[PDB]
RNA sequence: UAAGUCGACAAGAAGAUGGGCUUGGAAGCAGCCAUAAUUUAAAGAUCUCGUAACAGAGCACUUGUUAAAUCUUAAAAGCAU
């Protein structure tokens, strides 16, 4: 996974809910230096009593704003759709580089 | 490429493969290495 | 094969059509093995392949998936073609929907590339010929195979496009065959971020 | 990427020189500027005392450094009353296995551990385990431990 | 009378500050207790051993109990449940957390040899 | 000499290899799930060594300012923010929940002398524990009703645990504000008195920690519920209030 | 070996401390001596590259993700290349 092109991600989920699994796994792949590099992140933890649908927000440095539901998609299904857009940005940069 | 009778891996990237084997010849055993091209070896003569 | 078990997600628009077991008669062979004609049609085009019959495809359309299976896992021939047939379908599905691309970077003083027509050597009407100035006395021209689209965003950058990956990468390897990257100055043709370690001197 | 360099300089001796000149003059930062700040940082230490430094050169050649306590080896030797060696400084045993420059008492260790605990990054480590960290270094510099 | 340096002894060269004097040795009682225990980590000629050591070797055995000479499995290979009890109390709880940290050192010590040896097999 | 049937007394037949760190680490957590009534489950996100050391440095400072003049045990250093193996730590809960050592039949055990001595295998690494856990886990919904089911979704990805020898509300407010502050209940330390807490590295570490949940007296607790427990000034004092009524 | 084997990927791989000596310089990594400790989910006074010397990139080692329900690794023997 590549987080270079990811600007900021906002996650709101309930930990006790088994559906929030992919939300937490995605949060781990982020490198250590993502914070100081300028990538804003805000994680909200929902109470155990009331359970709202998890929300996973993603946005790249090219205006693309991705929003994928966590209940339906698995962690393996989240990364591919993320790096997919991160793949075109790398080649587009090379095509424009030099 | 060094043609030896005893080909051996010389690092972690060396791989043993059998290439040039087809319906006419048996082929040779090779030691391919993408890191160091000096690790290239072959077993057997044409 | 840990890849053959993985279902193949059919994205919206892609349609898989599994033929029926057929045997094309051959006078030079006493027994031909049956195969299955699998068509993968979609927005960009249509690709077809002939797989062995022992590979079973349970095409379930309600969920838009298709898993592969063999009749005997202990056979070496069936284990190999199980993974290979899966990798090809994955490329076909992802080639007719999105498309495969290859970027060629021309490093060196005096290396250029242009995309224009050469009606004299056209194998088919309107064939595009990639012209390369690679320090040779003669001009290097190559016609893109039918089904590919070649563009040049910059003089030192080529962009190949097509639905068949094998055809795109095979053509990208033919252009690189004229100037292979050297380890002393990096001059050559690099494909898809390919690099080469240089000498300190 | 923000680079970092290790340096051992005197207490208030900061100037373009072998220790400071080439260590930082090659990156691009203002060496003279650093010596101006290091002097203010070290205005209460005996002139000439060695002081390790970890200067972090951020991009654009903007540096920020954090002075550190003297080396543990320099303290044990300075406190062991070991014989002065060639170079105007105490020298450790060439082969600690047999040679013995001195024998520091545990009473000194408890003081060498506190001065090394004044640092924030080392302020959490329990003091108990810190006395055994220097005792494990005494065996390497040919210093014995007397109860 | 346990310390070699008596109270009042001047610790040479332990103060690098200008406006200050070197530390002075304090009474031994004021010092913490663990200091007097931190030193717990410091660890024909054969014919003499043959007639003295190997002599005492045999008769010291006193092979009455077989388990006495058993392999004496280390602490890092046992399977007996550690001294942990539910709602047992703070005392047992604290004592229970002491063995978990003791087993830690047992495994830690074994990694050095396993890491050192593998490093030795690569620099033969 | 030692016979064949003889086995060491401190190494009974286990369900899997013992020398391996997989099983050796399970025995630790099982005893940790019994000796530690109060436990908080976190989730670390690629914390470096210097960052970990900074987070553990503040706890040593915040937990050292707790008033304990009642001659109570020296409970200021047995509190550790420990990283655990989520996979094996998950099996630990199953073991403590669905395994009753009193359901084992003792069997003869041959010593070095060859004599048969009755012995029972109750160690958590025994084939009975592994067997009881699997069969007990076969049920899908009955498991969700247990404490384990209420904590399995939390044991996903990397997790760190803060073990307290027992329930001490004063120690929670000192540890909950340094890892999950939430004013005005658990306000963060002041800058005019704790300049180390607001350090570039220490501040960059807490941002990667996320207090997921807790476990108290073998009972699941949410982040909101932990505040109520920590909100109590003291346990003994709370009981006195009820007596006045 | 579902207590997730095997492979890959993501991050970590600390601190006392540039161990002492040697040397123009020797900071884990020319050479010599020592290599009980400490704190950690783990981290050799250092296994392979790298620097004039640092830095830096890997390894041992550690956690996590993906993922096998006859599918891991090694040795011996038989027949072949
Ligand atoms: Mg060197
Ligand atoms: Mg050295
Ligand atoms: Zn090689």
Swiss-Prot record, chain B:
Alphabetical GO biological process terms: translation
GO MF annotation list: structural constituent of ribosome
UniProtKB keywords: Mitochondrion, Ribonucleoprotein, Ribosomal protein
GO cellular component: mitochondrion; ribonucleoprotein complex; ribosome
Disulfide topology: none
Subcellular location field: Mitochondrion
Superkingdom of origin: Eukaryota
Keyword presence, Metal-binding: no
Keyword Mitochondrion belongs to the record: yes
Major site of localization recorded for this protein: mitochondrion
Subunit field text: Component of the mitochondrial large ribosomal subunit (mt-LSU). Mature N.crassa 74S mitochondrial ribosomes consist of a small (37S) and a large (54S) subunit. The 37S small subunit contains a 16S ribosomal RNA (16S mt-rRNA) and 32 different proteins. The 54S large subunit contains a 23S rRNA (23S mt-rRNA) and 42 different proteins. bL36m has a zinc binding site.
Family: Belongs to the bacterial ribosomal protein bL36 family.
Role, per record: Component of the mitochondrial ribosome (mitoribosome), a dedicated translation machinery responsible for the synthesis of mitochondrial genome-encoded proteins, including at least some of the essential transmembrane subunits of the mitochondrial respiratory chain. The mitoribosomes are attached to the mitochondrial inner membrane and translation products are cotranslationally integrated into the membrane.
Protein's recorded name: Large ribosomal subunit protein bL36m
Protein's gene: rtc6
């Amino acid at each position: 996974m590549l987080t270079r092109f990811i600007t900021d991600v906002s996650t709101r989920f309930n930990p006790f809910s088994a559906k929030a699994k992919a939300a937490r796994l995605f949060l781990s792949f982020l490198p250590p230096n993502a914070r100081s590099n300028g990538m804003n992140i805000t994680t909200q933890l929902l109470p155990r009593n009331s359970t709202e649908t998890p929300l996973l927000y993603v946005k790249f440095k090219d205006g693309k704003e991705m929003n994928l539901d966590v209940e339906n998609m698995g962690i393996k299904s989240i990364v591919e759709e993320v790096d997919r857009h991160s793949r075109i940005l790398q080649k587009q940069a090379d095509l424009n580089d030099g | 490429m060094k043609v030896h009778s005893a080909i051996k891996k010389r690092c972690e990237h060396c791989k043993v493969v059998r290439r040039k084997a087809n319906k006419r010849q048996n082929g040779y055993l090779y030691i391919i290495c993408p890191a160091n091209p000096r690790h290239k070896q072959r077993q057997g003569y044409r | 094969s840990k890849l053959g078990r993985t279902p193949l997600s059919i994205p919206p628009g892609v349609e898989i059509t599994i033929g029926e077991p057929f045997v094309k008669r051959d006078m030079t062979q006493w027994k031909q093995q049956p195969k299955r004609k699998i068509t993968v049609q979609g927005p960009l085009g249509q690709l077809e392949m002939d797989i062995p019959d022992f590979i079973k495809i349970d095409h379930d359309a309600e969920a838009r998936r298709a898993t592969l299976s063999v009749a005997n896992r202990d056979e070496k021939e069936q284990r190999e073609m199980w993974g290979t047939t899966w990798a090809y379908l994955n490329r076909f599905i992802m080639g007719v929907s999105e498309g495969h691309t290859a970027v060629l970077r021309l490093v060196g003083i005096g290396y250029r590339a242009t995309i224009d027509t050469r009606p004299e050597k056209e194998e088919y009407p309107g064939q595009q010929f990639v012209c390369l100035k690679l320090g040779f006395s003669h001009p290097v021209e190559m016609g893109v195979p039918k089904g590919m689209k070649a563009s040049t965003p910059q003089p030192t950058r080529i962009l190949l496009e097509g639905i068949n990956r094998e055809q795109v990468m095979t053509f990208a390897a033919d252009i690189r065959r004229w100037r292979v990257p050297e380890p002393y100055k990096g001059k050559g043709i690099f494909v898809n971020g390919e690099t080469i370690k240089l000498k300190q001197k | 990427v923000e680079q970092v360099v290790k340096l051992i300089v005197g207490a208030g001796q900061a100037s373009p020189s072998p220790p400071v000149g080439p260590a930082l003059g090659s990156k691009g930062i203002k060496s003279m500027d650093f010596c101006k700040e290091f002097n203010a940082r070290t205005a209460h230490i005996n002139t000439g005392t060695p002081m390790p430094v970890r200067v972090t050169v951020r991009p654009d050649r903007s540096f920020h450094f954090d002075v550190r306590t003297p080396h543990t080896s320099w303290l044990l030797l300075n406190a062991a009353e070991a014989p002065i060696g060639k170079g105007g400084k105490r020298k450790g045993a060439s082969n600690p296995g047999k040679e013995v420059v001195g024998t520091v008492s545990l009473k000194h260790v408890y003081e060498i551990a506190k001065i090394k605990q004044s640092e924030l990054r080392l302020s959490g480590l329990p003091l108990e385990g810190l006395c055994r960290a220097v005792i494990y270094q005494a065996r390497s510099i040919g210093i014995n431990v007397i109860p | 009378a346990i310390s070699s340096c008596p109270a009042g002894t001047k610790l040479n060269g332990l103060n690098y500050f200008k406006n200050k004097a070197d530390p002075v040795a304090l009474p031994d009682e004021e010092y913490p207790e663990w200091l007097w225990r931190c030193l717990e980590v410091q660890k024909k000629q054969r014919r003499l051993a043959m007639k003295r050591a190997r002599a005492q070797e045999a008769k010291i055995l006193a092979s009455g109990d077989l388990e006495a000479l058993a392999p004496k499995i280390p602490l890092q290979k046992q399977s007996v449940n550690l001294p942990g009890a539910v709602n047992g109390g703070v005392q047992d709880a604290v004592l229970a957390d002491e063995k978990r940290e003791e087993l830690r050192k047992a495994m830690r010590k074994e990694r050095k040899a396993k890491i050192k040896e593998s490093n030795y097999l690569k620099a033969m | 000499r030692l016979p064949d049937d003889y086995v060491p007394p401190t190494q009974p037949p286990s369900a899997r290899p013992v020398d391996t760190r997989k099983s050796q680490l399970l025995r630790t957590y099982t005893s940790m799930l019994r000796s530690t009534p109060l436990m908080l489950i976190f989730q670390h996100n690629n914390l470096t060594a210097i960052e970990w050391a900074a987070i553990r440095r503040e706890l040593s400072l915040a937990l050292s300012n707790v008033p304990v003049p009642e001659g109570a045990p020296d409970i200021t250093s047995k509190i550790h923010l420990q990283v655990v193996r989520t996979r094996i730590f998950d099996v630990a809960l199953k073991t403590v929940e669905f395994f009753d050592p009193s359901t084992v039949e003792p069997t003869t055990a041959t010593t070095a002398t060859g004599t048969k001595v009755p012995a029972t295998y109750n160690h958590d690494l025994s084939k009975h524990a592994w067997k009881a856990v699997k069969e007990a886990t076969k049920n899908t919904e009955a498991v969700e009703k247990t404490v384990y089911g209420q904590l399995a979704p939390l044991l996903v990805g990397p997790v760190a645990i803060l073990t307290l020898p027992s329930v001490s509300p004063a120690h929670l407010g000192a540890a909950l504000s340094v890892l999950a502050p939430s004013p005005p209940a658990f306000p963060a330390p002041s800058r005019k008195k704790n300049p180390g807490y607001y350090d570039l590295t220490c501040q960059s570490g807490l941002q990667k920690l996320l207090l997921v949940g807790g476990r108290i007296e073998g009972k699941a607790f949410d982040y909101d519920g932990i505040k109520w427990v920590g909100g109590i000034e003291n346990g003994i004092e709370g009981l006195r209030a009820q007596l006045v009524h």
